[PDB]
Amino acid sequence: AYTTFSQTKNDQLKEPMFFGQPVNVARYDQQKYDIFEKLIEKQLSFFWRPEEVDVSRDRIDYQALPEHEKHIFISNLKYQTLLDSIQGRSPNVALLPLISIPELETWVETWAFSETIHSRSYTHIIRNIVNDPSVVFDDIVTNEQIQKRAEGISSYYDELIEMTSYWHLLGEGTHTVNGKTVTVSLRELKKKLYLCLMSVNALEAIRFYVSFACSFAFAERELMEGNAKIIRLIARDEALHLTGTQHMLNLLRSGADDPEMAEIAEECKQECYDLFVQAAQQEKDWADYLFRDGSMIGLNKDILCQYVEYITNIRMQAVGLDLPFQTRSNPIPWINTWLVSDNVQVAPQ
Amino acid sequence: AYTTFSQTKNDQLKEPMFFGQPVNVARYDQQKYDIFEKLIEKQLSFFWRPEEVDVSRDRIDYQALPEHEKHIFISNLKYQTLLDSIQGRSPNVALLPLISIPELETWVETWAFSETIHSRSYTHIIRNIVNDPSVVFDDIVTNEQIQKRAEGISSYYDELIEMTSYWHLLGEGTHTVNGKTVTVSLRELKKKLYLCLMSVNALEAIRFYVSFACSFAFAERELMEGNAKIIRLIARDEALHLTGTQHMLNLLRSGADDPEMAEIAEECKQECYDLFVQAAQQEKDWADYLFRDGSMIGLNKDILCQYVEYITNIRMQAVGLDLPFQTRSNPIPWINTWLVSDNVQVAPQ
Fold first, then answer.
1. Which CATH number fits domain B1-349: 3.30.530.20, 3.50.30.10, 1.10.620.20, 3.40.50.300?
2. Measured between alpha carbons, how far is A226 from A223 in angstroms, rounded to an integer?
3. Which residues are involved in binding Fe cation 2 (chains A, B)?
4. Is B168 one of the annotated binding-site residues?
5. C-beta of residue B5 within 8 angstroms of C-beta of residue B24
6. Which chain A residues touch B if contact means CB-CB below 8 Å?
7. A122, A157, A194, A307: which one is catalytic?
8. After which residues is chain A broken (C to N over 2.5 A)?
9. Which of A139, A144, A138, A192 is CA-nearest to residue A164?
10. How far away is chain B from the Cα of A328, in angstroms, using its nearest Cα?
11. Shortest alpha-carbon distance between residue B81 and chain A (Å)
């Protein structure tokens, strides 16, 4: 029952963010939540093209890197490419069919688009620093460590999408499919969405910032500076993205948008906690993989793992979760130099 | 038959460098070979104290180094300390009892002295960068890799010294000691000296310059800069030392100083070749040990081994030996920045 232009003349200001009447007319003269309209405008103002950045010198730096430092840099590069390959398509595929207000619909399409620019930037970097890019891109799929993260992250999207299709096709209730029992529940579907949004919030607010530290650590050594200029632009976008998911999540659990969502959010509040913790742990184990052959000046397994905890505490408080780790100060305050923008607060506060 | 003041009024201008009448009066108004008088003056002009150099910042750099980069730096440090511990005492003990011209006698004492300043500089560095210097100094004796080099190098000195003692005590000829046959030969003793001088020439002209590359490579990264300032001063002295042994060796094999030495030099010309090659190989294997846990920006096993060959060819031509390696250009031309002095050519030409 998804329609690309619903014929009912509804008041889009009184629709919920999700699971309401699919958006017919795309209008921007008004909005239920102006935050999404502000995000669209900011993201539009930030528009950049990867080719604007000269990454020529990064080829030289890369070739001169010790093998284990190559491993650090290229592993990080591959992981970023994985994440935003997923973020390129997934917000559109998973969220669009469920959105019922115009400003949110357009923000999601703008969000996803900006991710394809990130993906394109990683191609721009890879083509310039390695001789055979195919080796790199193929390893993104076959790498045992990367593959584990891809599966967990993509499953939150995949389950939401499949349950959505059933909902559109069958509607709410218990059904008979080829002799099996299929129980479609809006409440369950609402839960699948909330969890998915929690996962994506962690993806962008935590997982990517761990990666930014690895990149900017080379830049601190005055290496891979072209790559760093691009990460700076990517980081500025990422601050908008996570802001978006933080408002979605908070508006959902407050009950102001949908009172039923408030209950569901409280029900799986433990699950969301466990989700964020499992992600933080997975990034700690990733630090182990990065530095398994040695570390470099200014960044190692110990330091990066501290940063994971420091950033994870911050992000979780923002979405109303208990802090899983000891209260600590910023283990790498030098990263705030790179995580800065005059138009948005990139660095976590 | 060694005398600290020989009573014969000899013409010191007509004495050989070695094995002649022990020097009685130390005079400097004249000399057989003014090169040694020029070396004394240069070395005196170069006089420095280790404490003049602030190495405080090197503690911070060192602690921030990755474990394998610590291993590189500290292994190199230990090896230098080993070499100049030997060079501190050995020129005096081994050469002084054999010298028969005043300018050479004083040069050797000045040479050895300048080495004790080098040893003292390494203590100054070690005390400032590590918490427990004893761990470091003890490893210089027990380290399997370092120990191998110490034994080979010290044996050339030890054999010369012992044969000298027999010569002074027994004189030339075949002797009976506790029922054993001891054949003292001046010709053999002259050979032991020539070989020893070849070994020391390689020690200072090759072995130490390999080490200078390792140190200045940190300085290129703007790390361990205090240490580098000291190595620069040490390198300038080393250029004098190797110049000294190059003139001793060349004056010996020319036959101008002692016609018998010319013959002996030609006899063991293969042996000297094999000596230098074995040393170059030993430094290549040392590169393997340094970088066994990984390398760093601008220096690795491959690069350092190239430098070993490049420097070894140069030093050997200077002492009239065949070149053991392919003719190559300087693999690390950046090292010449650090190997420079307005008063002496530090960099190999």
1. 1.10.620.20
2. 8
3. 115, 204, 238, 241
4. no
5. yes
6. 64-69, 223, 293-298, 300
7. A122
8. none
9. A192
10. 21
11. 26
